[PDB]
Design an enzyme around this catalytic site. Structure first.
Site, PDB file in Angstrom:
ATOM      1  N   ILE A   3       0.851  -1.129  -0.019  1.00 11.88           N
ATOM      2  CA  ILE A   3      -0.016  -0.125  -0.057  1.00 11.88           C
ATOM      3  C   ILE A   3       0.919   1.195   0.069  1.00 11.88           C
ATOM      4  O   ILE A   3       0.406   2.144  -0.469  1.00 11.88           O
ATOM      5  CB  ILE A   3      -0.749   0.045   0.950  1.00 11.88           C
ATOM      6  CG1 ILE A   3      -1.939  -1.034   0.946  1.00 11.88           C
ATOM      7  CG2 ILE A   3      -1.753   1.391   1.521  1.00 11.88           C
ATOM      8  CD1 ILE A   3      -3.038  -1.023   2.201  1.00 11.88           C
ATOM      9  N   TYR A  61       6.322   4.320  10.336  1.00  8.31           N
ATOM     10  CA  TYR A  61       6.914   3.435  11.034  1.00  8.31           C
ATOM     11  C   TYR A  61       7.444   2.162  10.180  1.00  8.31           C
ATOM     12  O   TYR A  61       8.022   1.018  10.880  1.00  8.31           O
ATOM     13  CB  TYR A  61       6.003   2.753  12.220  1.00  8.31           C
ATOM     14  CG  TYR A  61       5.571   3.986  13.141  1.00  8.31           C
ATOM     15  CD1 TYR A  61       6.517   4.954  13.475  1.00  8.31           C
ATOM     16  CD2 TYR A  61       4.343   3.886  13.761  1.00  8.31           C
ATOM     17  CE1 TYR A  61       6.008   5.936  14.252  1.00  8.31           C
ATOM     18  CE2 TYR A  61       4.008   5.073  14.821  1.00  8.31           C
ATOM     19  CZ  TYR A  61       4.868   6.012  14.886  1.00  8.31           C
ATOM     20  OH  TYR A  61       4.578   6.775  15.883  1.00  8.31           O
ATOM     21  N   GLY A  62       6.997   2.057   9.146  1.00 10.59           N
ATOM     22  CA  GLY A  62       7.408   0.684   8.228  1.00 10.59           C
ATOM     23  C   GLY A  62       6.443   0.629   7.174  1.00 10.59           C
ATOM     24  O   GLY A  62       5.652   1.488   6.864  1.00 10.59           O
ATOM     25  N   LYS A 117       0.490  -3.918   8.668  1.00  9.95           N
ATOM     26  CA  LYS A 117       1.754  -2.837   9.124  1.00  9.95           C
ATOM     27  C   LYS A 117       2.752  -3.499   9.521  1.00  9.95           C
ATOM     28  O   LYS A 117       2.437  -4.497  10.518  1.00  9.95           O
ATOM     29  CB  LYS A 117       0.987  -1.765   9.873  1.00  9.95           C
ATOM     30  CG  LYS A 117       1.736  -0.429   9.821  1.00  9.95           C
ATOM     31  CD  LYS A 117       1.190   0.527  10.441  1.00  9.95           C
ATOM     32  CE  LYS A 117      -0.275   0.811   9.788  1.00  9.95           C
ATOM     33  NZ  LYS A 117      -0.543   2.085  10.005  1.00  9.95           N
ATOM     34  N   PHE A 156      -8.998  -2.845   6.159  1.00  9.07           N
ATOM     35  CA  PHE A 156      -8.639  -2.258   4.913  1.00  9.07           C
ATOM     36  C   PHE A 156      -9.560  -1.416   4.206  1.00  9.07           C
ATOM     37  O   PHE A 156     -10.935  -1.705   4.210  1.00  9.07           O
ATOM     38  CB  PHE A 156      -8.160  -3.508   3.882  1.00  9.07           C
ATOM     39  CG  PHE A 156      -7.994  -3.172   2.486  1.00  9.07           C
ATOM     40  CD1 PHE A 156      -6.534  -2.654   2.118  1.00  9.07           C
ATOM     41  CD2 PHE A 156      -8.766  -2.688   1.512  1.00  9.07           C
ATOM     42  CE1 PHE A 156      -6.228  -2.151   0.945  1.00  9.07           C
ATOM     43  CE2 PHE A 156      -8.400  -2.303   0.227  1.00  9.07           C
ATOM     44  CZ  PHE A 156      -7.019  -1.698  -0.091  1.00  9.07           C
ATOM     45  N   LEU A 157      -9.122  -0.352   3.681  1.00 14.24           N
ATOM     46  CA  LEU A 157     -10.041   0.857   3.077  1.00 14.24           C
ATOM     47  C   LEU A 157      -9.303   1.095   2.020  1.00 14.24           C
ATOM     48  O   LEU A 157      -7.950   1.187   1.812  1.00 14.24           O
ATOM     49  CB  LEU A 157     -10.450   2.059   3.818  1.00 14.24           C
ATOM     50  CG  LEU A 157     -11.481   1.834   5.162  1.00 14.24           C
ATOM     51  CD1 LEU A 157     -10.835   1.252   6.411  1.00 14.24           C
ATOM     52  CD2 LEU A 157     -12.164   3.154   5.370  1.00 14.24           C
ATOM     53  N   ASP A 161      -0.038  12.979  14.241  1.00 10.81           N
ATOM     54  CA  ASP A 161       0.331  13.275  12.783  1.00 10.81           C
ATOM     55  C   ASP A 161      -0.766  13.067  11.891  1.00 10.81           C
ATOM     56  O   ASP A 161      -0.741  12.241  10.780  1.00 10.81           O
ATOM     57  CB  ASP A 161       1.423  11.919  12.450  1.00 10.81           C
ATOM     58  CG  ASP A 161       2.308  12.132  11.206  1.00 10.81           C
ATOM     59  OD1 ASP A 161       2.301  11.325  10.532  1.00 10.81           O
ATOM     60  OD2 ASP A 161       2.538  13.216  10.876  1.00 10.81           O
TER      61      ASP A 161
HETATM   62  O1  LIG Z   1      -2.495   3.342  13.629  1.00 13.43           O
HETATM   63  C1  LIG Z   1      -1.597   2.887  13.781  1.00 13.43           C
HETATM   64  O2  LIG Z   1      -0.655   2.561  12.926  1.00 13.43           O
HETATM   65  C2  LIG Z   1      -1.132   2.459  15.299  1.00 13.43           C
HETATM   66  C3  LIG Z   1       0.211   2.476  15.422  1.00 13.43           C
HETATM   67  C4  LIG Z   1       0.517   2.015  17.071  1.00 13.43           C
HETATM   68  C5  LIG Z   1       2.074   1.908  17.092  1.00 13.43           C
HETATM   69  F1  LIG Z   1       2.406   0.681  17.502  1.00 13.43           F
HETATM   70  F2  LIG Z   1       3.169   2.349  16.512  1.00 13.43           F
HETATM   71  F3  LIG Z   1       2.358   2.482  18.574  1.00 13.43           F
HETATM   72  C6  LIG Z   1      -0.205   1.689  17.845  1.00 13.43           C
HETATM   73  C7  LIG Z   1      -1.535   1.915  17.480  1.00 13.43           C
HETATM   74  C8  LIG Z   1      -1.943   2.221  16.404  1.00 13.43           C
HETATM   75  N1  LIG Z   1      -3.376   2.261  15.985  1.00 13.43           N
HETATM   76  C9  LIG Z   1      -4.366   2.405  16.989  1.00 13.43           C
HETATM   77  C10 LIG Z   1      -5.733   2.866  16.407  1.00 13.43           C
HETATM   78  C11 LIG Z   1      -6.928   2.825  17.342  1.00 13.43           C
HETATM   79  N2  LIG Z   1      -7.703   1.637  17.808  1.00 13.43           N
HETATM   80  N3  LIG Z   1      -8.509   2.002  18.759  1.00 13.43           N
HETATM   81  C12 LIG Z   1      -8.382   3.244  19.001  1.00 13.43           C
HETATM   82  C13 LIG Z   1      -9.058   4.101  20.025  1.00 13.43           C
HETATM   83  C14 LIG Z   1      -8.476   5.423  20.092  1.00 13.43           C
HETATM   84  C15 LIG Z   1      -7.350   5.869  19.421  1.00 13.43           C
HETATM   85  C16 LIG Z   1      -6.779   5.121  18.529  1.00 13.43           C
HETATM   86  C17 LIG Z   1      -7.364   3.616  18.400  1.00 13.43           C
END
Ligand SMILES: O=C(O)c1cc(C(F)(F)F)ccc1NCCc1[nH]nc2ccccc12
Length: 278
Positions: free
Chosen positions: A9, A14-15, A31, A68-69, A113
């Site tokens: 994608i 982060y990767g 991811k 997935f979107l 971000d």
């Molecule tokens: O979005 C990412 O890439 C991502 C990356 C990481 C890390 F590993 F890099 F730290 C951790 C969480 C990540 N998403 C969490 C999405 C999510 N689910 N529920 C939620 C409720 C409230 C706010 C956000 C919520």
């Protein structure tokens, strides 16, 4: 692997992110990236229609599996560049993103971000927050787009508040309206000075404590403020009013997501269907 890759994608911060199918047939975003393991897992029980759903966490390298979107707002804005996104769709997307942020922020989670390419849309008219900048906040190890960065971050504030996400969303709102990035800087100081040239160099009057910020320099040039009629011209006075409140310099004056949802700009909000080419 348990996943058959379909495509890459792209590259997140982060990767790499892949479109993959579970070999359940589910098509997902995969991811690739402890004790943070506990915090990340909490997010999975927290769900909101305007947040991309986190399906699984796997530490073995860190893997996050998301719903997935098919397209992001950056691609949709580019596709819509000759005509512009219709104002009712801009309004629906802004309203939905504020709903998502109000949810996150009520659970003390910041995005940090926000940018168009982290905002995912589907054929049903929904838009969802993705690619949260949560690694540092959780203690996870390992060219940057600065255009949506709040000024207190650029001035070296050590502690972010929820206001940083409102700033980013305001920048995105303006870009949806004008079809051009509000503050497209290419260095931290170019970003800062692009903000100052439009909104005025902040001082203690509009932003108490700004001159004590870690990266503030008294030798910053002093630019005067322009008029929002010049900044997002087509937008009506309800939208310009809301935008000005999302771009207040003082994070304490900047409108919250929940207060923004009650703003008169949304009195006639609807949920139109976008025209998506996939
Ligand atoms: O979005 C990412 O890439 C991502 C990356 C990481 C890390 F590993 F890099 F730290 C951790 C969480 C990540 N998403 C969490 C999405 C999510 N689910 N529920 C939620 C409720 C409230 C706010 C956000 C919520």
């Amino acid at each position: 692997e348990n996943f058959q890759k379909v495509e890459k994608i792209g590259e997140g911060t982060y990767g790499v992110v892949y479109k993959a199918r579970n070999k359940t047939g589910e098509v997902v975003a995969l991811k690739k990236i402890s004790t943070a393991i506990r915090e990340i897992s909490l997010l999975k029980e927290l769900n909101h229609p305007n947040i991309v759903k986190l399906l699984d966490v796997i530490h073995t390298k860190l893997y996050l599996v998301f719903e997935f979107l098919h397209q992001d707002l950056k691609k949709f804005m580019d596709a819509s560049a000759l005509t512009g996104i219709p104002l009712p769709l801009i309004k629906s997307y802004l309203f939905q993103l504020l709903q998502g942020l109000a949810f996150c922020h009520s659970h003390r989670v910041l995005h940090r971000d926000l940018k168009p390419q982290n905002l995912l849309i589907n054929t049903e008219g929904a838009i969802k927050l993705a690619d949260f900048g949560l690694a540092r906040a959780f203690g996870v190890p390992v060219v940057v787009t600065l255009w949506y960065r709040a000024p207190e971050i650029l001035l070296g504030c050590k502690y972010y508040s929820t206001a940083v996400d409102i700033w980013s969303l305001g920048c995105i709102f303006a870009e949806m309206v004008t079809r051009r990035a509000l503050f497209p800087g290419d260095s931290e100081i170019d970003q800062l000075f692009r903000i100052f040239r439009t909104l005025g160099t902040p001082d203690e009057v509009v932003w108490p404590g700004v001159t004590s910020m870690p990266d503030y320099k008294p030798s910053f040039p002093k630019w005067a403020r322009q008029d929002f009629s010049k900044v997002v011209p087509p937008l009506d006075e309800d939208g310009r009013s809301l935008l000005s409140q999302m771009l207040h310099y003082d994070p304490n004056k900047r409108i919250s997501a929940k207060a923004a949802l009650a703003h008169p700009f949304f009195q006639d909000v609807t949920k139109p269907v976008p025209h998506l080419r996939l």
